[PDB]
Amino acid sequence: TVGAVVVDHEGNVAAAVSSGGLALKHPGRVGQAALYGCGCWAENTGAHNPYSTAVSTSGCGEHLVRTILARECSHALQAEDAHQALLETMQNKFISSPFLASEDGVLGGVIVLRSCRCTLLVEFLWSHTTESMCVGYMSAQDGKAKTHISRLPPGAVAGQSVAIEGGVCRLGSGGFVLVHAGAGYHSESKAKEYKHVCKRACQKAIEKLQAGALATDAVTAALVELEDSPFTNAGMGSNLNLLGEIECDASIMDGKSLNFGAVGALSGIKNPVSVANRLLCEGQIPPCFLVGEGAYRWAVDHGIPSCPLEHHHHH
Amino acid sequence: TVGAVVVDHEGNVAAAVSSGGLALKHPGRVGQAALYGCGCWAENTGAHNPYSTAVSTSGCGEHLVRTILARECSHALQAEDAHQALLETMQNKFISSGVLGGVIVLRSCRCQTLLVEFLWSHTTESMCVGYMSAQDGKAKTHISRLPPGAVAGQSVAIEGGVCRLEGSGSGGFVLVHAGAGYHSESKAKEYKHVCKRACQKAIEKLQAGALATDAVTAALVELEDSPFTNAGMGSNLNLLGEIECDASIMDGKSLNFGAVGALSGIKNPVSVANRLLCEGQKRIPPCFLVGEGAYRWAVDHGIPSC
């Protein structure tokens, strides 16, 4: 799973997530990266929401679905202390959730940002119960992406412990992006490549913003980079299902309009997040969630780059 | 869309929903009836949940801005005044910020006897519900209408009632709905009839000792099989003339969930969803399958076709 959250120079936020899902899964299994409120969430500031918040999640299994994690984080982040809100959500709402009481371990992660105009004050955080997680982030002003591998401290237990880190940025035509290349087992061998792909992803989003793109276009451009890495379980290199085939989930949410696009169990499309983004764009009753054969056909009919030799129609 | 909610003799609740979705929809479009927390919800009483609650919803496609409806209703039903809670939810999510839909809900708490409060509410012109207790022995069916002069999508109708249950029989309670939409006085007899049969199937399951999820599944199987409901047989055809069904089910005791989306070729979609939930209690087993792979899984598990 990969994800990104973006805030533009006006405080508009967007979030997206993309995954290949559980390795060896049964054909047609759709997980958190496609599901409304579970994989990502983005909500501009409003009447009862004093912060603009964007959330994207990581992990596989049904752990993030059962808890509707992304929307839950977004709601917790309306409290004053963002760090305490996210940490308590990860511990109470995610690890010790009643929805996951029958589990020996709960594995996942999140990236979040929240902004409010005071200039723009952007707080951003990441948190995970996996051994490690690779993040990247960048402001349009600072001009250089920063990447970091977040690890559970010695003595922590994967699936029982929370690591949480973050920071603050003050912010023209700029903005801020936080991305992640996945949460899982530590792989020191692949660490530079995950850091490298997080760096390029941030730069793509910041480039889009600086050129005037919408927050959703910026976050989509970052996810396209993250999918394209053969090392991430999304897009190219997604886990193979039980039949040895690729089936991708992806979704995206716009904080300004609250619109949402998503694809599930999609084969034959190089960048699943692009279909989800196209649905959100066209949808501004248009569909927001397309799966399987029909999703592929819809993407092809909308000019989204395909690959017919990687598309399966069992039927 | 069709739905049902069940409470067993011990206060365990279950909820399910099944739909053919938007007529002429693009192939592969999956709607609320397949989505966790949106189409149905069931949650036994717990630490922060003083009531056992079960919710099933009905909609015509027009998605709500940021709602996750069934789970939102369930949380609203933790307030003292259930009627006011549901009404305020319907008002904010549908009328305030027209959107056409409906809900059925129940909430129970142990007093040993069981107090069951049940409600239905809609912004559609009309909605047909049925309900039955294991004790009363006779199903009740009812057609709810918007008050004369009201405007669909701008008014909320809400009705309900209260039932008490002997807490140690093999009894329970079921509420179903055959859909929320335009009033059709001609088809009213069949809609009340299918809700009656659906309730009795659920009550029969309960009295034989079945789980609440098996009972709610048996009621949705009857509702699906009616050609007048937009679910199972007689579902709206998509843009290419094909049937694609969404369905889901949730267990209040275990909080497990099963769901299918864009499912074709299977007579009773809710049976696949129930089967996924059933198998997920016996690699993390799947809870949500769509399209061809869902059909293949269902066929491989003995669930009937066509």
Ligand SMILES: */C=C\S(=O)(=O)N1CCN(Cc2ccc(OC(F)(F)F)c(F)c2)CC1
């Ligand atoms: C079950 C989790 S998953 O979505 O299958 N997935 C497997 C691929 N993995 C890649 C990954 C793992 C660790 C990691 O952290 C590190 F800091 F870089 F080592 C990472 F960035 C990516 C993600 C989990």
Ligand SMILES: C=CS(=O)(=O)N1CCN(Cc2ccc(OC(F)(F)F)c(F)c2)CC1
């Ligand atoms: C949202 C549109 S839909 O395509 O999901 N669907 C289309 C079919 N329609 C059938 C129906 C209509 C009215 C009903 O109630 C009663 F007034 F009693 F007749 C009833 F039970 C069933 C329900 C909505």
Ligand SMILES: [Cl-]
């Ligand atoms: Cl599976």
Ligand SMILES: [Cl-]
């Ligand atoms: Cl459509």
Ligand SMILES: [Cl-]
């Ligand atoms: Cl399919």
Ligand code: NA
């Ligand atoms: Na990849």
Ligand code: NA
């Ligand atoms: Na039907």
